[PDB]
Design a protein around this nucleic acid. Structure first.
Lengths: 82, 656, 123
DNA sequence: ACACACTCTCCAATTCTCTAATCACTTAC
DNA sequence: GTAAGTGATTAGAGAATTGGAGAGTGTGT
């Protein structure tokens, strides 16, 4: 079997890779908010495609939102916020 | 066995066109059929053979229409017809089909009942049985009545209930949502016979209590397919306006088709090639992204998400609707039903409800509870929407504080049983909970209407004391959070969740007005009981929990087919947390941004005037303001925090 | 109880079965066993007793005799004789509607009529 | 040889129960 | 009223039940 899980979400393909992807993104606050949202959403899709290619972007983000409740991911976020 | 059934069935008579001709020994043939049905086993062989031969449509109903039919012939025909028109689960002794082979027998029983319903689309049958009802109740005094005729009258009344509780039929064809149902033809024949006036007369008598629960069931089953909004507006038309309206409808259809086809045929491109997107990485090492169609611009790329198969939930945990066959019937049927509803309110309602409420929850049978709550909800909504304010005297059985008390008790018990049990039993109890919740919502709205628009100050004071009791006591103020924390899509329908959202909307408006006028300042709380100051922001802050906001984001996905009232309720609840508590960090969430993306794509297809004309403009504007507030101070770690639901200390540490 | 409502302690020229079938889809109902036995009785009576009008002879018994003289095994019956007033008009009605079910019953009846007049015909 | 169907096995999700830690209430000065 | 101690609630972990996907193998064209 194969499934997206906490090892992958905390691994080198995970949240740190998403942070490194987001370092170059700098929206203009005076522009259209829906246009800025579209620009952000496809960077989410790009990171999800690299991180787990089997699944749709919608299901990937649902699975990440589910896996945020795990204690291992919470401990990772506590360390990562420093 | 079934050679006996085949011998008995074909020995009755034959239907010439316009006349049924009878053999002399119909009485003994019907006795033998009743005897076989009594001795049938768990295979239900004799019953299934009778369903195969179609006794009710072919023989028994045309036999009952005959004028020469004697007393005993009529009596034993009604006995056999009642036994054949019994429902399927009642035949199976209440157990649902738990097995692959049990379901086959259940379906075989059900189709025979569905086939038989069009036999009762003739007024002559109801005319034939109305005379026996009139003989017992009107033409015989209470001292001189006979138990034989009493039992026959009980059989006739139960037969009417069994007839109106038959399900619709799919096999005859598919029918549009804007014409008369097949149920409506039986309703037309039933009302044209005038037997309903006799039933109303019987229901008015205090002495005849044993028929009252069944008569309540009959009128609820008549109003099964309707809503109060269909009947509340008085019907009127002019054919000039109708012709102009229909021409404009087809103009809309034609213009939509032409625009869509020209867009689609202009989308295509001629030749091919293959291309590299320099600057985007591939899965394999040192690789750039590769595409195999002539893309207009790099942002049009999709990473082939169209290929990938969607993940499904397991079969125990998918959402489910409950379907009522609901349609906009013709003006004739709507006028007849409006007259019938007004006559019920004038002649029956107070006595019928008073007689029923002592008994409905004591009985073994489940279904009359659902019928009770349905009839309450329908009648109170009809009175409020039709603004027939002089009828408010006639529904005085339901206006007291005791109505709120008893409704709350029954609703609480249904919610606990539906949450704790498992399977079809849990779904069965949750179905009762849904109707109880709807009746509660109508109670709240009717009391507000009385307090706003009644002419008598005594009536206004009586309504105001009940409203103050609802606002004050903790059980009524804590009910929405209590239900929302126990909601589960395995055992409760989507209709329940929509009803709960609308109920919460109306209740919170009532609490806000009673705080704003200063009538609510201090509140009793259990410990002993002690009184503490009340704050409306402290009350609103309870709904900002994640376990509540999940379902609001869940229902906002269906924005393109929700009603405008439901869309307003969802946007208002989010708007309160966004701009009254002034806490947008709890709403910064990716699963809401997906809804905003869908709304923005929907609004791209409209000109700047049509966008302001659209019904979804409130949701568009709210999404605009929240996204501008988000991007005013964008950072990458904030974009990471958008992936997770944020608790209270998480909000404090993100803010500070 | 509904059982107590529906059941009672009292539950503890003959009819022409065939003439009441005239309107049905006859394929569904000639498989009923009480109908097949009745048709099988009446066709044997037709074979034994039919008289041509103006004639005193049992036509199909004479035909069976001349069939047995040649040792043939099929017998020809006229639809006019089936559908006349002295025939069996219910059988003539049912026959074009369900021939696969009806011809088998008529074969069985004809075999039983022949085997009594000529017991050697089993050979 | 290739395609299609069926069966078995494993793994993941959920819910109950027990244990430990942190927070709040009660008691005493 | 304030400080300290004890009780209760909440969070995590372990164990058991239910269901569905995937891969392998056998049979028919």
């Amino acid at each position: 079997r194969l499934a997206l899980n906490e090892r992958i979400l905390t691994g080198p393909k995970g949240i740190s890779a998403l942070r490194e992807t987001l370092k170059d993104f700098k929206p203009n606050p005076k522009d259209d908010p829906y246009a800025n949202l579209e620009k952000l959403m496809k960077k989410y899709a790009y990171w999800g495609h690299l991180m787990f290619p089997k699944m749709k972007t919608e299901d990937v983000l649902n699975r990440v939102e589910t896996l945020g409740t795990r204690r291992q991911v919470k401990v990772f976020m506590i360390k990562h916020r420093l | 066995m079934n050679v006996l059934v085949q011998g008995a069935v074909h020995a009755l008579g034959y239907y010439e066109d316009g006349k049924y001709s009878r053999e002399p020994d119909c009485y003994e043939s019907i006795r033998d059929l009743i005897r076989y049905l009594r001795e049938d086993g768990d295979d239900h062989t004799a019953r299934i053979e009778c369903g195969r031969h179609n006794l009710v449509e072919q023989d028994l109903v045309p036999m009952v229409k005959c004028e020469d039919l004697t007393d005993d012939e009529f009596d034993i025909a009604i006995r056999l017809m009642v036994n054949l028109c019994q429902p399927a689960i009642s035949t199976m002794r209440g157990k649902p089909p738990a097995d692959r082979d049990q379901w086959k027998m259940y379906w075989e029983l059900e189709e025979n009942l569905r086939r038989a319903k069009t036999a009762f689309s003739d007024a002559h049958f109801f005319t034939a049985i109305k005379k026996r009802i009139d003989n017992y109740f009107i033409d015989t005094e209470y001292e001189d009545r006979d138990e034989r005729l009493r039992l026959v009258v009980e059989r006739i009344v139960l037969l009417i209930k069994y007839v109106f509780s038959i399900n619709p039929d799919t096999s005859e064809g598919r029918r549009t949502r804007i014409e008369d149902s097949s149920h409506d033809r039986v309703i037309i024949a039933f009302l044209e016979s005038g037997i309903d006036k006799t039933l109303m007369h019987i229901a008015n008598q205090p002495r005849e209590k044993e028929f009252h629960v069944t008569i309540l069931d009959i009128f609820a089953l008549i109003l099964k397919e309707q809503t109060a909004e269909d009947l509340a507006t008085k019907s009127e038309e002019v054919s000039t306006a109708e012709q102009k309206k229909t021409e404009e409808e087809f103009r809309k259809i034609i213009e939509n088709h032409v625009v869509k086809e020209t867009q689609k045929r202009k989308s295509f491109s001629r030749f091919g090639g293959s291309y590299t997107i320099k600057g985007l990485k591939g899965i394999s090492a040192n690789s750039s992204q590769v595409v195999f169609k002539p893309i207009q611009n790099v942002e049009k790329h999709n990473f082939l998400d169209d290929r990938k198969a969607k993940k499904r939930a397991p079969r125990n945990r998918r959402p489910f609707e409950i379907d009522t066959n609901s349609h906009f019937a013709s003006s004739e049927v709507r006028g007849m039903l409006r007259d019938m509803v007004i006559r019920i309110i004038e002649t029956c309602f107070n006595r019928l409800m008073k007689s029923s409420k002592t008994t409905v929850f004591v009985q073994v049978q489940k279904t009359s509870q659902i019928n009770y709550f349905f009839l309450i909800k329908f009648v109170l909504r009809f009175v409020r929407l039709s603004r027939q304010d002089h009828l408010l005297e006639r529904i005085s059985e339901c206006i007291g504080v005791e109505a709120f008390h008893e409704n709350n008790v029954q609703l609480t018990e249904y919610v606990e049983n539906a949450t704790t049990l498992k399977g079809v039993e849990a779904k069965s109890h949750g179905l009762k909970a849904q109707y109880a919740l709807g009746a509660y919502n109508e109670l709240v709205l009717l009391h507000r209407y009385i307090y706003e628009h009644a002419k008598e100050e005594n009536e206004r004071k009586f309504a105001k004391r009940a409203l103050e009791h609802i606002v004050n006591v903790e059980e009524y103020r804590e009910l929405p959070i209590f239900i929302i924390k126990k909601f589960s899509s395995s055992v409760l329908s989507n209709n329940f969740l929509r009803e709960l959202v609308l109920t919460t909307h109306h209740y919170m408006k009532l609490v806000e007005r009673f705080v704003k006028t200063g009538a609510l300042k201090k509140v009793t709380k259990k410990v002993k009981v002690e009184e503490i100051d009340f704050q409306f922001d402290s009350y609103v802050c309870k709904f900002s929990n994640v376990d509540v906001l999940k379902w609001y984001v869940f229902l906002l996905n269906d924005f393109s087919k929700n009603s405008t009232e439901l869309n307003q309720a969802l946007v208002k609840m989010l708007h309160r947390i966004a701009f009254d508590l002034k806490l947008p960090i709890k709403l910064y969430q990716v699963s809401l941004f997906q809804v905003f993306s869908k709304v923005n794509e929907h609004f791209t297809h409209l000109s700047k005037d049509l966008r302001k004309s659209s019904r979804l403009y409130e949701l568009y504007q709210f999404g605009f303001h929240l996204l501008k507030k988000f991007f005013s101070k964008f950072t990458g770690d904030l974009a990471i925090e958008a992936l997770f639901w944020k608790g209270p200390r998480e909000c404090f540490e993100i803010e500070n | 109880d509904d059982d107590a409502l529906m059941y009672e302690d009292g539950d503890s020229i003959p009819v022409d079965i065939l003439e009441n079938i005239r309107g049905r889809t006859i394929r569904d109902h000639v498989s009923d066993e009480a109908v097949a036995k009745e048709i099988e009785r009446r066709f044997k009576n037709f074979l034994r007793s039919f008289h041509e009008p103006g004639n005193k002879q049992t036509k199909y018994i004479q035909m069976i005799k001349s069939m047995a003289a040649d040792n043939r095994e099929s017998l020809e019956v006229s639809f006019t004789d089936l559908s006349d007033d002295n025939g069996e008009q219910n059988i003539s009605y049912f026959l074009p509607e369900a021939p696969n079910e009806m011809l088998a019953i008529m074969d069985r009846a004809a075999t039983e009529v022949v085997m009594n007049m000529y017991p050697f015909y089993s050979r």
